[PDB]
Amino acid sequence: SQIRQNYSTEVEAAVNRLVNLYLRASYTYLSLGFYFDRDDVALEGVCHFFRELAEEKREGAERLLKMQNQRGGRALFQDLQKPSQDEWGTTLDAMKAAIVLEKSLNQALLDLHALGSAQADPHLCDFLESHFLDEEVKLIKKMGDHLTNIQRLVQAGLGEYLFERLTL
Amino acid sequence: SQIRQNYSTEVEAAVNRLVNLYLRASYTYLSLGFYFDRDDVALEGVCHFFRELAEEKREGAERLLKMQNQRGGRALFQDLQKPSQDEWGTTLDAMKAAIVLEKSLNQALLDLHALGSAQADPHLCDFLESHFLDEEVKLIKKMGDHLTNIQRLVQAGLGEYLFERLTL
Amino acid sequence: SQIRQNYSTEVEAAVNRLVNLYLRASYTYLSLGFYFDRDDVALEGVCHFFRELAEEKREGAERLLKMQNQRGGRALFQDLQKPSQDEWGTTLDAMKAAIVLEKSLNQALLDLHALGSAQADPHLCDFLESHFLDEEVKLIKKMGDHLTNIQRLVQAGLGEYLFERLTL
Amino acid sequence: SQIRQNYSTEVEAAVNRLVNLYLRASYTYLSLGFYFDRDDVALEGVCHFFRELAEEKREGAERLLKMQNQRGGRALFQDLQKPSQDEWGTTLDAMKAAIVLEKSLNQALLDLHALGSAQADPHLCDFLESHFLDEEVKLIKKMGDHLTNIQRLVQAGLGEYLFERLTL
Amino acid sequence: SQIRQNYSTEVEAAVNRLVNLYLRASYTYLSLGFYFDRDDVALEGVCHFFRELAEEKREGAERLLKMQNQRGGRALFQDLQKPSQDEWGTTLDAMKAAIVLEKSLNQALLDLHALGSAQADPHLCDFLESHFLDEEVKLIKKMGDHLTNIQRLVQAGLGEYLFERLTL
């Protein structure tokens, strides 16, 4: 590319893999959201929590794609694997699955940052630090807070209702 | 009638029967509402839920009556049978009875739609699709959601109070 | 009931009968209203007059039901008989039928008041005097006024049109 | 056409015929309107009633034409026959002629709907149900209501004046 | 008195006794309110419920006093006995005591009404019917509703907290 400067082939490829990871995460949160919209699950606050996360992850992918083009890299899309489950159990089960997922995304961001550092690519490092790293830390903290409160509430049915009503 | 066109005697009669079904449903929800207003029941949110439904069913009957006249059919009213119960038990009992009732109304709508289709009466089919079919589906979903939450909450007294306070 | 005080079983039963009378009256005015909406009758002002009365009688029943509960009585609903006619003739015929109906309701109110007086139930007497007795007198006067004007106008077709247009 | 999908040649042709029917109806209502504007007829309300209908039918033709193009069909216009009369008699005569005309248009819509159903063309069926079928039913009801009131008013001169003044 | 007309000595005396009853009730609700303000009781909503009732009963006494003077009777005040308890137990205990108290006041009103009726004193009867009788019925209904909800909630500590938070 005419504009490409200090943008390795390794970073370009890793950015494409991170895009796939973010789209997969968006898809997972779509499934989580609509599961909590089932008539036999029916926790609206939980549904909305995960649907909002689906939008956030999709937006993350789009930001990575915009950056790929700004640097002169080339987007390459792959098949998006379906989420790991069809049914997500309780709010506790779902929140545990969500924190596992966010930690996997955070680790991918940290690996990409390390790659950027090894490649002396300060624009990549700043891009990651400004739009992703702190957002992941804040989100993981919030999910941890939720998990603690859910666990404290487990008369499990009553607890799950109250958490949805009074926190989410 | 001078205006009557493509409106069978079978549809006209079925519209009159559906009017009676909607008025009966309105009457049932009136009884449900005032039961939850008893001093020894005292669940205001439940009372208001069912009183609002009474109004909605009455409005449905009125819409069917307006349509009957628009098509040149003739309204024929019958005795309205009293509701199936004098006392409705818990919120759970009442919500179960309500979903049974809505499903019976929905089936009547579906039967009328099938009759309309057999009679090649597209105005009837559209009328039903625009003002009744989707409203029944949405209402039945909402009642299903409520039933699931009520069931999750059954320390039954505490659960019933919390549902009334925080959902209804 | 824990709240019940100075509320006889005779008054409670008579209140339930009056509720049935008011619901029957509402049903009658529904039939009257939609008859005047027929394409071969087509007197919109007459239709609206009776549809508004249907709402007023229904509201009266609801007020009686609210009072029943406030006093610790128990609502008991019965079958609602269909209106006395399927077709209501002219505006004059309909207005004559309406005044007969209102006088029957007024007599029922007066009988209930007498029962209340015999039972030394001043709350009942005041309830009736504040929400029903004067409303019936005013409504019966208005219908009498209408009847006189309709009668004066009977070139019967022209008269019926003019009354609907210029009074109703 | 590059866009054409599930749009039979039979429906395309029937849509062109319906366009001609709607334009002919618009032309008829233009003639009706200006007849009531004659100095020796002079019923302004009647004139305005029919001129508004002329606009509505023209708008219907235009909607059918827009739909023809959306589906990839090709508009084909034919000669527009002049209205069936040069003079339209009384308001009663004119309203009778108008209801005959609307019923003919409604039957054409119903036939097109049946054709669409036979051709499994759900877009056509929905298009007809959303913009034409209910509008025809409402208009035919209104004309029936008018006819009944006109008939009740026939001292024919006085009646015709009063209807124009107080209804139209 | 120069203004006194149709106001018996029996009614005057009974009005003075009712004033003492209303002031005693105000005093009782003052005690109830401040008990729920204790640091070892600490139910703010319950405190406010009873403090508002203290004001309402005081206002009732003042209205009776105003009426006494309007009729030309003479206010005579007596010692006000202290409330029946120094400590009021749970919210349930307190609400039970409150409904007992209101029923005693209501019976006193009904007795005064009967006295008025025996003395042919229609101004007294109307005064009672307009400012006291319906207010007592509504208040007793509300307390009954509260009692039912409190009882349903008795994990007694949790129930008492939730009622105070979500109803009062």
Describe this structure in words.
The structure is cut from a larger assembly and holds 5 copies of chain A (168 residues). Chain A has 5 helices and no strands. Chain A has 168 residues and is mainly α. Chain A has a single domain, classed as Up-down Bundle (Ferritin). In chain A, helix 1 packs antiparallel against helix 2 and helix 3 (91-118) runs antiparallel to helix 4 (122-153). The longest helix of chain A has 32 residues, at 122-153. The N and C termini of chain A lie far apart (47 Å). Chain C binds chain D through residues 39-42, 44, 155, 157-158, 160-162, 165-166, and chain D through 141, 144-146, 148-149, 151-155, 158-159, 162-163, 166-167. The PDB classes it as metal binding protein. Keywords: 4-helix bundle, metal binding protein. Complex of halothane with apoferritin. Chains A, B, C, D, E are Ferritin light chain.
